[PDB]
Design a protein around this ligand. Sequence first.
Ligand SMILES: O=C(O)C1=C[C@@H](OP(=O)(O)O)[C@@H](O)[C@H](O)C1
Ligand SMILES: O=C(O)C[NH2+]CP(=O)(O)O
Length: 426
Amino acid sequence: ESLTLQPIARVEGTVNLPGSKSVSNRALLLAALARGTTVLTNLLDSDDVRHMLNALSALGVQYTLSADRTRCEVTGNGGPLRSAAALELFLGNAGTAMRPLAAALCLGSNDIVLTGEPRMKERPIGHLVDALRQGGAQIDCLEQENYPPLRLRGGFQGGNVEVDGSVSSQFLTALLMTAPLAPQDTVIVIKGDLVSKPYIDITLHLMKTFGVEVDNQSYQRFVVRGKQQYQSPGDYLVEGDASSASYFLAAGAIKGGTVKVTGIGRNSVQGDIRFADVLEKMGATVTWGDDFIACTHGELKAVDMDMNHIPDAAMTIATAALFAQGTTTLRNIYNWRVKETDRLFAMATELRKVGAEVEEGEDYIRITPPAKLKYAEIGTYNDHRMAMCFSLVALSDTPVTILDPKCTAKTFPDYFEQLARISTLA
Ligand SMILES: O=C(O)C1=C[C@@H](OP(=O)(O)O)[C@@H](O)[C@H](O)C1
Ligand SMILES: O=C(O)C[NH2+]CP(=O)(O)O
């Protein structure tokens, strides 16, 4: 399957964003654990959220979904999830299901196997397993240490644990969400650097919404009290996805017009709102509201930036760079290599097909645009963001053909229709 995007002369309009994947999967898990019934509004319907919903169903969590799957009423368990069955749960390639559930299912005495798609068995989890085992959990890595599939037999108590923060923030996120329900207090020491720090902020905001605080000592040590229970907030509004927003804001920066996204704004908890600052640095004009961000085209110039704070939206800069004057350098993005695909390899390979010169560094990418873009069929590596990032090539005089366009469904099933709504073809 393939989708050819014809050249787009102008983009403009307003996009009502689908829900945030990151917020959706945290909110579902916390609602499942909490005391009380939580009503989630603007929940994302996408593969990663569906895998979480299916796992929660299999684990006995009671919830209802609206017809469009964006409103979800969760009856909280008031405690750790429990199953009497020797289940195997398939989690696709959803890190925000696999990592949080691997920790949560270490509470108690279940016997559950977590698995997923082939790529998920190549995505690291050992830093999380190590910390959970230090806290008393029984875990078997059925194929190889540091990777799924995992057999979880429970037993997490708490105590003094160390977690490496240098590969994924999700390991720390998973520990933080599980530790409050453990029988003992947990002190989490971060071994070295912490990547993707804004996602830790999301986790802490969500936990606070659900009635639980922790002592964050400069992102280097966390003190969590055990014996707690999450408390439903009642209604909870899931923010629009700021990573999904990046494509539309960039499209405005490149080929607007003014493109406005709604459902996020200056006070959002998602770190990817900071992507708009990069477009501003490149020369676009950005306007902020409490519930919108808008971007208007101006002449674009390349940037050289550390992107560790926005690793997902950073991919959008890599293709927006094709429209900027000069060489763009994106630094401190090593964990691109351990995500839906090796994104440093994939982005460099596909950028070259449209004519860019690319230096693929170990943990950075340097992109020098060609004078004129070339027509290419873009491989997407079963990676939603490869498809969405390369859609921007069509904001030029050259079409682009996106292979396997349905991979956008990991986070954004209707991406191409939403892009078309704001596009005027040349
Ligand atoms: O916690 C989260 O919601 C996420 C954390 C990030 O992963 P890393 O911490 O591995 O960079 C990000 O890439 C992912 O899409 C969502
Ligand atoms: O969404 C992204 O760009 C990266 N997702 C990684 P996951 O959410 O599967 O851990």
